[PDB]
Design a binder for these strands. Structure first.
Lengths: 173, 129, 227, 60, 93, 143
RNA sequence: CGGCUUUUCCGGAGUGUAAAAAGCUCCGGGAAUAAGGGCUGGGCAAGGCCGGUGGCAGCCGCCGCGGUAAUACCGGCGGCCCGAGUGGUGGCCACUAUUAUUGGGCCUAAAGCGGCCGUAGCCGGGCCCGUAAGUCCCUGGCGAAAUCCCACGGCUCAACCGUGGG
């Protein structure tokens, strides 16, 4: 046995439609490589395959797996608390990308621009539930979402950090 | 030589439907054929069906309601368990629960849906949709 | 919408009707597109259909599938001609295909557009998948087959958001028809895009042909025409 | 979004529905004058007989 | 700041196992001597009989995990404990 | 007629028929008999080391016209002699008699001759443990 | 142009070794401070100008370009893809319904034996009684672990590992 990549490369690299769509997603969300996007899309496809297999299965094990799948998806915040097994097929990549650490902190207004958010996360200025995490590609659970704050020892815990008032003004502006 | 009455009967039914004939006569009126004719009638594909005492093998008379896209006989009578239905059902029904398969089981020749409801395996004999 | 009615008003004010179908669409008697289809009438004035379906005039809803250059040889030159395979369809289950001959590309495109307008057909849509079963017209209601040339195309219902699993030509054809997901299986030469497009059109048209019981309509939420 | 579920014509001689681009025909009953018979192309070309549902009148 | 999360007494061995957190926000990882001298205070142990096994600093965490032992007689460590840990704690030259 | 056999209890003839007509395929037939492994001068090596014997110009197939430079190489692995193309522009100057060259496949259809050049099968990659690509580019220097 | 962070570098402290080693983690000084590879006629469509070579040099996965303005050779400019990677060669699978049980063909494209008999093999009319071998359902022992999938938990997340289910 050898371990295997968790992401699936696209079947054809030079399709104009996919190229432009991925480019738009890249520019909006500003990932470093298409590798991250492909990893996220592979996660999406995994969830969709699980839903497909479960929808056609009868048995106690199928029910337990279905409940667990819905529980995890709700835990991620990707679905409402009254979600069913049908709408999961309607999930898109953008739902996942909205749940990214970088996307969440930027939506939490701690960065003027999400690239600056990526820098802050990398340099360890952003803590999750009091614990730091240096992967912007990390996926943030719903429960974690309210505990996202600046790292305590980092200067950004200081309200007077010169970049901090610019951050807060751009948030206000 | 007539190796099988059932497949011939179903082929005749389909060919009659396609042109649009009103009444169909099945020459080797076997018991299994009669049990078969009961099934899709119970599911409304056909109307009344009757037996005729011909003195050779009898003849089965049916009238066509124009509601049978295609009917045939799954020939090598594959034994199927309760869980393996969707495998064969994906092979012979155009869509999900579109049409019915017919299974010869311990409790008789009878519809695949009810067999799932009874949870009993058997041997596929024919398909129609 | 309001723009579409505005164009309907313009083409009503201009187009004098000739055929028999023209008046009871210029007189307000007919209001549904499928009112043409149900009675088995015929269409030879494209101006009729856009009066009921102005959405054709959108640029996105009209596709050019192929441009081909056919060479009629002659004793004093290789006189060429453009054949345009085009498809015009709204995104609510009505679509048509056409082939236009032209001395120039532009005239070929115009004639192809008109012929695709005249070959408009209604469509059945549903959720026949063994997985989705959502009772919404995202896919075909059931497995169907179309044939043309050596091309045989079997469309099978596919789960929601799968994406059109078919070649690009069929991708465009099913895109303009208001259908979103499908499994495809092709046999023969798919390279000749004209025959492939015709086979897909045959499959979509055959979608109507199947006999249907009232229960399965509620089962699959079948939509015939406009969703 | 009110559903405009129409009524697809159904040919009397067979009971099948009529495809949009078929060369079927609809006509008032030539005997009773009350019922409109629909007749699809498959029935028409083969000229298999049709029966009126009102007076029972029959005719190819 | 030291917060003990577990104190297990191994009656068979005669030792108190000590599992603890140390809060050192914005500070280096504390030295062994300082943590030993702080630990002995509120538990009233003999420094010679007490040995600190490990002090692991979790990544990006200002709370460090520490594990130590506190025996009863001076012979138990010599007979039982690895010779190297005392050398780390300096109880052996 | 209909495809046969189809009986429930005719597994043997089905299997035997499939085995019988699988040999008619050429890919599977080649793989099982390992014919390439018997015929390969490289004996299954994607890359091989050899010694140049001489330099030859070969005419490209019509309608193309050109004088393609290449080198005959005596293989160290088994002694058999094969001809290898020299890619790049003017690369033949860098190559000399009695030069330790490293060659690989040329990439033609079925691993055969590529492009308009017929009969050739291999191209020269390295010479004296220095790569031809840089030498034609001139970035590195031959020893 | 102004402001800001600390990837690296230096020091200390822990673990660390049963020994350093890992520089692993924490704190401290301090600085903008590690980036290429291939392609750029079409099949790949992803990308257009300039100079040189001129049936030569050459390129080319295949189709093809070069016989003097070369969007295809070479070089410059510009552009496209991927990226701490990226190209060249060889093998297996898919591509391929070109191995066809699902699911290929056999009049003219490769393929019906020239025909007939018949052993084995394969496939076989209808009704009723019987056995229950195949078959279908239930049920007990069994098919090592790891590896597969899933939820939860530990290493910052993950990779990895434990717990529970299949």
């Amino acid at each position: 046995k050898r371990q295997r990549k968790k992401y699936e490369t696209p079947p054809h690299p030079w399709i104009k439609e996919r190229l432009d769509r991925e480019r738009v997603l890249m520019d909006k969300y500003e990932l470093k490589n298409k590798k991250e996007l492909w990893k996220h899309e592979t996660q999406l496809k995994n969830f969709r395959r699980r839903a497909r297999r479960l929808l056609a299965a009868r048995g106690k094990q199928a029910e337990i797996e279905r409940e667990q799948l819905l529980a995890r998806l709700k835990r991620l915040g990707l679905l409402p608390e009254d979600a069913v097994l049908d709408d999961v097929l309607s999930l898109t990549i953008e739902d996942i990308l909205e749940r990214r650490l970088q996307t969440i902190v930027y939506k939490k207004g701690l960065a003027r621009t999400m690239r600056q958010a990526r820098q802050l996360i990398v340099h360890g200025h952003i803590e999750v539930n009091g614990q730091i995490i240096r992967s912007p590609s990390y996926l943030v659970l719903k429960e974690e979402e309210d505990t996202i704050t600046y790292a305590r020892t980092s200067p950004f815990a200081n309200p007077q950090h010169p970049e901090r008032m610019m951050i807060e003004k751009a948030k206000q502006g | 030589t007539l190796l099988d009455p059932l497949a011939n009967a179903l082929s005749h039914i389909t060919n009659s439907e396609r042109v649009g004939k009103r009444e169909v006569y099945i020459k080797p009126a076997s018991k299994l054929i009669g049990e078969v004719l009961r099934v899709m009638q119970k599911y409304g594909y056909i109307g009344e069906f009757e037996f005729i005492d011909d003195g050779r093998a009898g003849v089965y008379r049916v009238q066509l309601l124009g509601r049978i896209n295609k009917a045939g006989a799954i020939k090598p009578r594959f034994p199927v368990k309760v869980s393996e239905f969707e495998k064969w059902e994906k092979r012979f029904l155009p869509a999900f629960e579109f049409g019915i398969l017919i299974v010869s089981t311990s409790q008789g020749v009878m519809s695949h849906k009810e067999a799932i409801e009874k949870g009993i395996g058997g041997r596929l004999i024919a398909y129609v949709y | 919408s309001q723009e579409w009615k505005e164009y309907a008003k313009r083409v009503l004010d201009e187009w004098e009707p000739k055929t028999k179908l023209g008046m009871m669409v210029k007189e307000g008697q007919i209001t549904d597109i499928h009112e043409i289809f149900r009675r088995g009438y015929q269409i030879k004035e494209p101006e009729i259909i856009d009066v009921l379906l102005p959405e054709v005039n959108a640029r996105e809803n009209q596709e050019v599938l192929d441009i081909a250059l056919t060479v009629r040889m002659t004793d004093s030159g290789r006189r060429v001609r453009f054949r345009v395979l085009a498809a015009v369809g709204n995104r609510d289950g009505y679509v048509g295909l056409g082939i236009g001959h032209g001395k120039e590309v532009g005239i070929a495109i115009r004639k192809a557009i008109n012929y695709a307008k005249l070959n408009i057909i209604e469509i059945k849509r549903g959720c026949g998948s063994w997985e989705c079963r959502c009772r919404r017209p995202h896919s075909v209601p059931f497995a169907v087959e179309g044939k043309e040339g050596s091309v045989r195309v079997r469309l099978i219902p596919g789960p929601r958001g799968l994406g059109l699993v078919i070649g690009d030509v069929g991708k465009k054809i099913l895109r303009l028809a208001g259908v979103q997901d499908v499994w495809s299986q092709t046999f023969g030469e798919t390279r000749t895009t004209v025959n492939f497009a015709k086979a897909v059109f045959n499959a979509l048209y055959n979608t109507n042909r199947v006999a249907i019981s009232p229960e399965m309509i509620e089962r699959y939420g079948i939509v015939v025409g406009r969703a | 979004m009110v559903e405009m579920k129409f009524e697809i014509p159904v040919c009397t001689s067979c009971g099948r529905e009529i495809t949009p681009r078929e060369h079927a025909t609809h006509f008032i009953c030539p005997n009773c004058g009350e019922a409109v018979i629909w007749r699809c192309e498959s029935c028409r070309v083969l000229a298999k007989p049709y029966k009126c549902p009102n007076c029972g009148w029959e005719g190819p | 700041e030291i917060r003990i999360k577990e104190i297990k007494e191994n009656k068979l061995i005669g030792r108190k196992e000590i599992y603890f957190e140390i809060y050192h926000p914005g500070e280096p990882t504390p030295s062994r001597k300082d943590v030993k001298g702080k630990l002995v205070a509120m538990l009233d142990l003999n420094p010679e009989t007490t040995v600190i096994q490990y002090i692991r600093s979790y990544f990006g965490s200002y709370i460090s995990k520490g594990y130590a032992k506190a025996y009863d007689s001076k012979e138990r460590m010599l007979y039982i404990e690895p010779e190297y840990i005392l050398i780390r704690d300096g109880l052996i030259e | 007629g209909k495809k046969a056999p189809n009986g429930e209890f005719a597994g043997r003839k089905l299997k035997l028929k499939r085995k019988k007509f699988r040999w008619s395929d050429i890919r599977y037939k080649r793989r099982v008999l390992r014919l390439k492994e018997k015929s390969d001068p490289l004996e299954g090596a994607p890359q091989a080391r050899g010694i140049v014997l001489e330099k030859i110009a070969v005419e490209a197939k019509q309608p193309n016209s050109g004088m393609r430079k290449a080198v005959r190489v005596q293989l160290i692995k088994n002694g058999k002699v094969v001809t290898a193309f020299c890619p790049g522009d003017g690369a033949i100057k860098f190559i000399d008699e009695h030069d330790e060259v490293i060659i690989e496949g040329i990439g033609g259809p079925k691993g055969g001759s590529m492009g308009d050049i017929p009969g050739i099968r291999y191209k020269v990659v390295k010479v004296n443990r220095v790569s031809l690509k840089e030498l034609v580019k001139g970035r590195k220097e031959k020893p």
